[PDB]
Amino acid sequence: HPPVVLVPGDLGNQLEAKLDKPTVVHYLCSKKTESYFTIWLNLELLLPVIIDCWIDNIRLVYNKTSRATQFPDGVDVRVPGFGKTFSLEFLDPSKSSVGSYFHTMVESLVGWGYTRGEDVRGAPYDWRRAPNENGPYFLALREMIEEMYQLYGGPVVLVAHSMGNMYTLYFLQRQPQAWKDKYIRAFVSLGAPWGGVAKTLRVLASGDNNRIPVIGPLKIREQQRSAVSTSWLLPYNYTWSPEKVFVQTPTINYTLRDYRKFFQDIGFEDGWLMRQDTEGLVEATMPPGVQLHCLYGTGVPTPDSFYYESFPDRDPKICFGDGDGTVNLKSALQCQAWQSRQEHQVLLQELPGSEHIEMLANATTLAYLKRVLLGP
Numbered sequence: 001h002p003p004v005v006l007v008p009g010d011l012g013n014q015l016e017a018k019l020d021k022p023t024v025v026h027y028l029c030s031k032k033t034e035s036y037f038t039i040w041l042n043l044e045l046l047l048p049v050i051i052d053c054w055i056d057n058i059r060l061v062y063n064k065t066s067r068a069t070q071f072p073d074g075v076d077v078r079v080p081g082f083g084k085t086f087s088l089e090f091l092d093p094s095k096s097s098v099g100s101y102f103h104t105m106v107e108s109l110v111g112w113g114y115t116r117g118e119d120v121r122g123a124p125y126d127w128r129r130a131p132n133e134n135g136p137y138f139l140a141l142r143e144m145i146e147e148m149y150q151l152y153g154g155p156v157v158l159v160a161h162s163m164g165n166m167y168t169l170y171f172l173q174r175q176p177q178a179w180k181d182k183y184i185r186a187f188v189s190l191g192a193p194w195g196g197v198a199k200t201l202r203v204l205a206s207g208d209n210n211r212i213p214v215i216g217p218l219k220i221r222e223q224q225r226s227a228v229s230t231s232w233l234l235p236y237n238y239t240w241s242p243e244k245v246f247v248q249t250p251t252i253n254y255t256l257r258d259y260r261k262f263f264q265d266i267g268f269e270d271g272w273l274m275r276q277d278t279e280g281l282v283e284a285t286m287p288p289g290v291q292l293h294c295l296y297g298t299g300v301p302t303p304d305s306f307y308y309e310s311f312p313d314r315d316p317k318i319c320f321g322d323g324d325g326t327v328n329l330k331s332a333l334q335c336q337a338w339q340s341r342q343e344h345q346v347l348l349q350e351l352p353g354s355e356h357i358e359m360l361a362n363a364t365t366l367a368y369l370k371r372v373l374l375g376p
């Protein structure tokens, strides 16, 4: 059975930090730590008041001159567990029941005879950034794939979830065809937002605390805006018509042709600069050039557009379309367009009723993967 590399989505792996800050936003925030500590996912950092300290440390700072992000003064961030799986199996190291992400799938793989850290490895990354600021990650990923090929005697299967699919596509678009034919067996795509997702507009405008309901939407909005990856996943014109209204208010409509105005009007001009930096990174029309298995959820109400009575600081009414709860059906179907640009097969698998995160622990998903890995 072939070696496997797992690529997570947004919020999809642990992050660690170390501090030596010149100033803090409250006296109760720690200025200095002697070693690295878990900054994601650690529930104690997310309580009211203390959450201000967390935001101050986990935010990225956007530099308009360099068109690049930096960490706050005296803050360093590390991605643990590269080449292992622990940091994407469980988001909170203190805690099994909360943060369980790739754990169920890795348990299945291990039951099928895989060994963590050897023929199954994780490729976690700083998911706050888009691929243009994760160069070193892609070098490490290339090297790890080559090593696994040599050690385990064949090409690797890449298995990616959500935004991890866009990271993986970026990587594959930049490797020569001869390299991919030698080293990549297949690419299994789970819940890929190839065209962006509509709910990114609500996230940027008013915040989204649906995961983290103990925290205020206006507080978490600060983190979500600071992450380049958020603006990278705004809807794209290769999926959506420029005349589709994503956000309606009493006096103005916003389509994907109105992003500059949108960012002005929500008070977040840096987001527009981030979108310009990132909108071209994955070419809409360049196929991956490998056997692709595109798995997407349907039949789950998925935010499609938003009506604001008062914009942007009051919660909107939501209009729902088809998809997996997060990824709109239209964005997930992008993979089929690549079939006419590449010779390798593109296989579609609809997963009716399968929710965005739950698809990773779903029996039908795992049965499909088993067939890909272990054969008939």
Ligand SMILES: *[C@@H]1O[C@H](CO)[C@@H](O)[C@H](O)[C@H]1NC(C)=O
Residues within 6 Å of the ligand: 063, 064, 065, 066
């Ligand atoms: C922002 O970028 C410019 C050019 O790279 C530089 O002059 C300035 O110091 C940067 N800000 C920092 C390092 O805080």
Ligand SMILES: *[C@@H]1O[C@H](CO)[C@@H](O)[C@H](O)[C@H]1NC(C)=O
Residues within 6 Å of the ligand: 245, 248, 250, 251, 252, 253
């Ligand atoms: C916004 O668009 C909808 C239909 O897409 C329309 O009913 C509404 O009148 C428009 N509002 C404005 C201010 O253009």
Ligand SMILES: *[C@@H]1O[C@H](CO)[C@@H](O)[C@H](O)[C@H]1NC(C)=O
Residues within 6 Å of the ligand: 236, 237, 238, 279, 280
């Ligand atoms: C599609 O959107 C891109 C930005 O992603 C923009 O460059 C382009 O003008 C749009 N139109 C066409 C025909 O691609």
Ligand SMILES: *[C@@H]1O[C@H](CO)[C@@H](O)[C@H](O)[C@H]1NC(C)=O
Residues within 6 Å of the ligand: 350, 351, 352, 353, 354, 355, 358, 362, 363, 364, 365
């Ligand atoms: C698992 O996915 C299947 C088929 O794609 C779906 O019918 C089922 O509802 C999912 N499991 C759960 C708990 O939703």
